């Protein structure tokens, strides 16, 4: 079972790549030292073998949202808007282990050495949530395989063998966006604004003397200046959520998440609104089921998942999370 979610981001996408990168005033990511390098947290990048010139394939850059990130995003939106309302409408009470195993695959950092008995494997893989996302102490394999978020670009041309041969973007899709802090007590000016601060203006002046003493001279003060590389907004991406012998209830839970994906954010950078997106299409083994009012189609999967919300107790989560 293959699902292809073609989306368009509304805001810039920023999924921070680990790595202490650096940036000058104008371009030159990671310069030679001594040109007053500014800190830079780039967006998450993926190297791809791509058709550069006629007959040559090279490992070019193309920057993405990780499949781990959207696997947890799909899992979190499933839990926040399907499973938790169900379990609070029926009053089923999770434990701390069931809760942590539902959102993170495990309850603790130590998996159990023993394997789970086959009846337990069959019940938790026929479960419409635990079958999608496995884990647990006995390390269950989930039926859901979540790919990372590829933009429709020339770099991903070798990746998009079927479909997306149009909407083909050539140029660069990243931007260095600069955000700074001030110390706002270095921006006070008027003591009538300082009368809100207790102790008078003398304490604010003491903080002025603290930051000038820091400026002549490793306790950091404030007033930073940083850059982060984001993806441009308005470009169209492709997501691939595939399944390994799914029950119809598991597919229905995936489509229930895909109906209200658009509330959640496909990025980091929560305060800067980064990650707003609108789903242009959803392919259910190649057939388009997406409309403006959610998903039009896949009625057997939705019915299966409607029969799966009924009869859903916290007990399955509890002996999924219970360690031997």
């Amino acid at each position: 079972m293959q699902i292809e979610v073609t989306v368009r981001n509304i805001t810039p996408i920023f999924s921070a790549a680990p790595g202490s990168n650096y940036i000058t005033i104008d371009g030159t990511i990671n310069p030679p030292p001594g040109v007053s390098r500014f800190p830079l947290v780039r967006t998450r990048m993926m190297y791809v073998a791509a058709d550069v010139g006629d007959g040559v394939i090279k490992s070019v850059p193309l920057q993405i949202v990780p499949g781990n990130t959207m696997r947890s995003l799909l899992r979190r939106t499933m839990l926040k808007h399907v499973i938790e309302p169900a379990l609070v409408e029926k009053g089923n009470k999770l434990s701390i282990g069931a809760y942590a195993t539902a959102y993170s695959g495990n309850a603790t950092g130590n998996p159990d050495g023993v394997p789970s008995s086959f009846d337990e494997i069959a019940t938790m893989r026929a479960h419409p949530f635990i079958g999608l996302f496995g884990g647990g102490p006995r390390m269950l394999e989930g039926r859901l395989m979540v790919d990372s978020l590829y933009p429709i670009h020339t770099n991903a041309e070798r990746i998009l063998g079927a479909g997306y041969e149009n909407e083909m973007m050539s140029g660069p899709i990243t931007q260095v966006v600069w955000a700074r802090r001030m110390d706002p007590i270095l921006n006070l000016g008027s003591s009538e604004d300082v009368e809100v601060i207790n102790g008078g203006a003398v304490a604010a002046n003491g903080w002025i003397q603290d930051l000038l003493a820091n400026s002549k001279a490793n306790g950091r003060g404030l007033k930073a200046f940083n850059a982060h590389e984001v993806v441009i907004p308005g470009l169209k991406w492709v997501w691939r959520i595939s399944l390994d012998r799914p029950t119809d209830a598991q597919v229905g839970l995936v489509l229930l998440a895909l109906n209200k994906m658009t509330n959640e954010r496909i990025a980091g950078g929560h305060s800067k609104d980064y990650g707003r997106f609108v789903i242009d299409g959803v392919s259910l083994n190649g057939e388009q089921v997406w409309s403006q009012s959610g998903i039009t189609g896949g009625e057997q999967y939705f019915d299966a998942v409607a029969e799966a919300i009924d009869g859903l107790s916290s007990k399955e989560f509890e002996q999924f999370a219970q360690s031997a």
């Binding site: 006070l188 003591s191 003398v202 002046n205 002025i208 003397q209 000038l212 003493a213």
Partner: protein, 234 residues
Amino acid sequence: MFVKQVFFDLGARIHADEARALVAKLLDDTQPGLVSALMNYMPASKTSKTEFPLVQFSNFNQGFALLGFGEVGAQILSDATPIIHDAMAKLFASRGQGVVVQVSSRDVPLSCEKRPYGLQYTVAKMVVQKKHEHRERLANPETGKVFLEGLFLRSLERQAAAVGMVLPRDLVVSFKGAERVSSVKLRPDSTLAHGSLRHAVFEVNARLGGLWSVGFLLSKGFGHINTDLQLGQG
């Protein structure tokens, strides 16, 4: 090398020489070594040094500012800043409701390169006469011109020598004109005054890349301006 610029904001403008007098009075009672270094005094007595002033006051729209040339002046400025800022805090909290004292800092590097074309620089509040012979030279433009050329060249040379960087010695200078002629006073209500030029224009073939001080009375905030602003200012 580099010169450090510290800006002090009190919400009202006070003149640079008046701020110099005001700064000495508040700290006269305590910490005399800090005042000696700031005003460029001799380490034994109250008489200031004959050499180039490393620490000088300047102009600031909402107050005054400090210029420390070189590492020594920057260090003197670095250790002087909290005590002086606390002094204005106590002085302006003693009377009135109270005002937030606001500081700023820049570390302007110094550079110079020789170019084979003339370049224009304007200096405001330029004191040029300090003995009678300079008044005699200023009467005739031909013999005052070469005096002003030598004054400008020796000012650039002594500032380059005091900051510790090498200046090329093939520089040629030229003086076009000054807008006004006015007197300055050493102390208020004193009959003695020194003649001075206002908005003087000079042309040097070389270029300058920072704060440069020329002429006499450098510690009073007289006759220095930022050249880095004046490249292409128009």
